Write a protein that holds these residues in place. Structure first.
Motif, PDB file in Angstrom:
ATOM      1  N   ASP A  60      43.200  51.476  48.028  1.00  0.00           N
ATOM      2  CA  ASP A  60      44.450  51.772  47.262  1.00  0.00           C
ATOM      3  C   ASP A  60      45.672  51.777  48.199  1.00  0.00           C
ATOM      4  N   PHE A  61      45.581  52.360  49.429  1.00  0.00           N
ATOM      5  CA  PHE A  61      46.637  52.313  50.424  1.00  0.00           C
ATOM      6  C   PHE A  61      46.999  50.834  50.749  1.00  0.00           C
ATOM      7  N   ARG A  62      46.018  50.008  51.122  1.00  0.00           N
ATOM      8  CA  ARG A  62      46.332  48.582  51.446  1.00  0.00           C
ATOM      9  C   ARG A  62      46.925  47.839  50.231  1.00  0.00           C
ATOM     10  N   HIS A  63      46.453  48.133  49.011  1.00  0.00           N
ATOM     11  CA  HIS A  63      46.935  47.444  47.784  1.00  0.00           C
ATOM     12  C   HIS A  63      48.464  47.583  47.623  1.00  0.00           C
ATOM     13  N   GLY A  64      49.042  48.754  47.969  1.00  0.00           N
ATOM     14  CA  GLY A  64      50.491  48.938  47.789  1.00  0.00           C
ATOM     15  C   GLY A  64      51.321  47.936  48.582  1.00  0.00           C
ATOM     16  N   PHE A  65      50.861  47.479  49.759  1.00  0.00           N
ATOM     17  CA  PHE A  65      51.624  46.473  50.559  1.00  0.00           C
ATOM     18  C   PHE A  65      51.556  45.046  49.878  1.00  0.00           C
ATOM     19  N   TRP A  66      50.392  44.678  49.279  1.00  0.00           N
ATOM     20  CA  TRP A  66      50.285  43.414  48.473  1.00  0.00           C
ATOM     21  C   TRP A  66      51.275  43.476  47.313  1.00  0.00           C
ATOM     22  N   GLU A  86      71.455  40.469  40.443  1.00  0.00           N
ATOM     23  CA  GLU A  86      70.097  40.636  39.860  1.00  0.00           C
ATOM     24  C   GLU A  86      69.116  40.939  41.023  1.00  0.00           C
ATOM     25  N   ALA A  87      69.300  40.294  42.207  1.00  0.00           N
ATOM     26  CA  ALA A  87      68.385  40.547  43.378  1.00  0.00           C
ATOM     27  C   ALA A  87      68.589  42.010  43.901  1.00  0.00           C
ATOM     28  N   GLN A  88      69.851  42.489  43.943  1.00  0.00           N
ATOM     29  CA  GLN A  88      70.166  43.881  44.355  1.00  0.00           C
ATOM     30  C   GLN A  88      69.533  44.914  43.391  1.00  0.00           C
ATOM     31  N   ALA A  89      69.556  44.607  42.073  1.00  0.00           N
ATOM     32  CA  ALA A  89      68.884  45.471  41.084  1.00  0.00           C
ATOM     33  C   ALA A  89      67.316  45.466  41.294  1.00  0.00           C
ATOM     34  N   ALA A  90      66.719  44.290  41.521  1.00  0.00           N
ATOM     35  CA  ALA A  90      65.266  44.171  41.835  1.00  0.00           C
ATOM     36  C   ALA A  90      64.897  45.053  43.067  1.00  0.00           C
ATOM     37  N   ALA A  91      65.739  45.009  44.096  1.00  0.00           N
ATOM     38  CA  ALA A  91      65.499  45.825  45.316  1.00  0.00           C
ATOM     39  C   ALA A  91      65.518  47.328  45.028  1.00  0.00           C
ATOM     40  N   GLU A  92      66.436  47.805  44.174  1.00  0.00           N
ATOM     41  CA  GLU A  92      66.395  49.181  43.629  1.00  0.00           C
ATOM     42  C   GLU A  92      65.064  49.529  42.950  1.00  0.00           C
ATOM     43  N   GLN A  93      64.488  48.602  42.175  1.00  0.00           N
ATOM     44  CA  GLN A  93      63.173  48.826  41.537  1.00  0.00           C
ATOM     45  C   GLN A  93      61.979  48.927  42.556  1.00  0.00           C
ATOM     46  N   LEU A  94      62.121  48.376  43.807  1.00  0.00           N
ATOM     47  CA  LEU A  94      61.093  48.577  44.857  1.00  0.00           C
ATOM     48  C   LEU A  94      60.817  50.052  45.135  1.00  0.00           C
ATOM     49  N   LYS A  95      61.816  50.924  44.945  1.00  0.00           N
ATOM     50  CA  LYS A  95      61.700  52.352  45.256  1.00  0.00           C
ATOM     51  C   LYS A  95      60.530  52.974  44.451  1.00  0.00           C
ATOM     52  N   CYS A  96      60.201  52.438  43.269  1.00  0.00           N
ATOM     53  CA  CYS A  96      59.079  52.970  42.456  1.00  0.00           C
ATOM     54  C   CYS A  96      57.691  52.784  43.287  1.00  0.00           C
ATOM     55  N   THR A  97      57.532  51.625  43.966  1.00  0.00           N
ATOM     56  CA  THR A  97      56.346  51.306  44.767  1.00  0.00           C
ATOM     57  C   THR A  97      56.332  52.222  46.059  1.00  0.00           C
ATOM     58  N   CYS A  98      57.472  52.380  46.741  1.00  0.00           N
ATOM     59  CA  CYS A  98      57.592  53.304  47.906  1.00  0.00           C
ATOM     60  C   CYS A  98      57.177  54.759  47.494  1.00  0.00           C
ATOM     61  N   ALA A 100      55.443  55.974  44.850  1.00  0.00           N
ATOM     62  CA  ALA A 100      54.031  56.129  44.389  1.00  0.00           C
ATOM     63  C   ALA A 100      53.144  56.335  45.631  1.00  0.00           C
ATOM     64  N   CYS A 101      53.262  55.474  46.629  1.00  0.00           N
ATOM     65  CA  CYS A 101      52.406  55.581  47.817  1.00  0.00           C
ATOM     66  C   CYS A 101      52.706  56.922  48.569  1.00  0.00           C
ATOM     67  N   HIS A 102      53.998  57.272  48.737  1.00  0.00           N
ATOM     68  CA  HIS A 102      54.357  58.552  49.458  1.00  0.00           C
ATOM     69  C   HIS A 102      53.728  59.767  48.740  1.00  0.00           C
ATOM     70  N   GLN A 103      53.783  59.820  47.402  1.00  0.00           N
ATOM     71  CA  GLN A 103      53.256  60.958  46.628  1.00  0.00           C
ATOM     72  C   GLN A 103      51.768  61.155  46.892  1.00  0.00           C
ATOM     73  N   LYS A 104      50.986  60.073  47.082  1.00  0.00           N
ATOM     74  CA  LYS A 104      49.509  60.197  47.296  1.00  0.00           C
ATOM     75  C   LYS A 104      49.159  60.421  48.795  1.00  0.00           C
TER      76      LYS A 104
END
Ligand code: HEM
Ligand code: HEM
Ligand code: HEM
Ligand code: HEM
Ligand SMILES: [Zn+2]
Ligand SMILES: [Zn+2]
Ligand SMILES: [Zn+2]
Ligand SMILES: [Zn+2]
Lengths: 106, 106, 106, 106
Positions: A60-66, A86-98, A100-104
């Motif tokens: 699960d840890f390695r999966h977050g980088f894929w 639109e690319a700047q807005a997509a980069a804001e949505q990366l924070k959801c992936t950062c 999730a991994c920090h919480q676990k």
């Protein structure tokens, strides 16, 4: 580089994308983020040091980088094709992936 | 870690997957292929040495490694899930991506 | 068939996944969400009724459903392979894509 | 909306792309192919009528349509970006997905 050096690269470049003026700035920062995610993938974090390499937690840890690398692939198409806001807005949505991994695992 | 060495790694592992005994051997070969693709992406190939880094040819060359990495991500889910014959069929479909790049740039 | 009915299906199935006990229940709910997002993709929301179908706003509205369906494809591999907790955590992360579209176009 | 009707739609629009003159013609053809692949996903092919709907063969059959739609997503970014020759080359590579399902299940 070690895991904490790659996390400083991800954090610094997310700030550059938020304040960027043009496509060349956003493409260079997204490229640097993808290289840092690919290098972070080989690490074992401190909270998982006692687990086995093949454990469900290490999968699960390695999966977050894929997942992060596939999201950066899509945002690079937008930044190269006259869709920089639109690319700047997509980069804001990366924070959801950062987050999730920090919480676990952080 | 030059382009020719990365190409050797891709070709040798594709052969390991074809002849594999079990899921563990398929997963280990697919992971070695993804590491070699991420390393190859930084190269300028001999036939594009006279082109700009921002040329449409250099964008299309780099793009083929992103496409290979996303195909390997999906095949790794199958190999980890008891779908080993399906993962070996997915690895044979990677040859489409290898051949398209070679016809243009090798 | 309307956009509001498809949105109610997406919200109801997120709640089913959070309360689930087994893989069959998660796979059934994820599949119903994919069919609702594929039906919503052809709708025009109230705030964009005045825009060209080939406008940048309509391209970005349709793009959010392409992103949502790719995230459900990945979660379905986890649910089929016995990784029920990991599929539940992937479904919670879908909320990032829901929230981004609503802030721009609802 | 039967399986044979969807297959005629996929075949006619693939042929449009190969000798298209402009971006608008390639975007219209790719969009028609994605809608036909989504409708084909619900069908049972004659050679799998005696299998369970939950069999490994029926999971593999449905998976081929998920793979085709992800390939069309990436080719739509190129066709919208002034990369029409690159989108036509991506459409040639779809053929490997069509031929892999036909060899197993047609
Ligand atoms: C763009 C998304 C990300 C950003 C901006 C980010 C940022 C950071 C920052 C600033 C730190 C603290 C470094 C320090 O001590 O100064 C950190 C640590 C950490 N991050 Fe991330 N991160 C991201 C994604 C991820 C992902 C996807 C994972 C797991 C798949 C992850 C796992 C960790 C772990 C385990 C630590 C602790 C390292 C240690 O204490 O040794 N991060 N991250
Ligand atoms: C799994 C897929 C692939 C396999 C099995 C493969 C295999 C090979 C092999 C065996 C060589 C000969 C290396 C030598 O000189 O000894 C080669 C060369 C080359 N490949 Fe690939 N390849 C693959 C994917 C790609 C992709 C996707 C690209 C472009 C995006 C690419 C670009 C090249 C180029 C430019 C050369 C020539 C390098 C030179 O003359 O120095 N390859 N590849
Ligand atoms: C799983 C993610 C999603 C959930 C749970 C969700 C949930 C909802 C809910 C509960 C409503 C209110 C329905 C009503 O007023 O009756 C709604 C409305 C709306 N949603 Fe979503 N949604 C999701 C994803 C999206 C996406 C990805 C988009 C755009 C790409 C989107 C666009 C809209 C719009 C435009 C409305 C307003 C409809 C109207 O006022 O007629 N939604 N959504
Ligand atoms: C762009 C890709 C594709 C093209 C151009 C294509 C084209 C065709 C054509 C022209 C037929 C003949 C239909 C007839 O005899 O009336 C056909 C049949 C069929 N195709 Fe495809 N196809 C594609 C992708 C797929 C995929 C991805 C699958 C499976 C996941 C698939 C499964 C079938 C099956 C099962 C039949 C036989 C249907 C029957 O006999 O009733 N096709 N296809
Ligand atoms: Zn996209
Ligand atoms: Zn898949
Ligand atoms: Zn995945
Ligand atoms: Zn792409």
């Amino acid at each position: 580089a070690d895991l904490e050096d790659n996390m400083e690269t991800l954090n610094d470049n997310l700030k550059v994308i938020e304040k960027a003026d043009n496509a060349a700035q956003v493409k260079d920062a997204l490229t640097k983020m993808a290289a840092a995610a690919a290098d972070a993938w080989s690490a074992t974090p401190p909270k998982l040091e006692d687990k086995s390499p093949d454990s469900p937690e290490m999968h699960d840890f390695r999966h977050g980088f894929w997942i992060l690398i596939g999201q950066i692939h899509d945002a690079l198409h937008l930044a190269n094709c006259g869709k920089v806001k639109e690319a700047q807005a997509a980069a804001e949505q990366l924070k959801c992936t950062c987050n999730a991994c920090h919480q676990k695992y952080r």
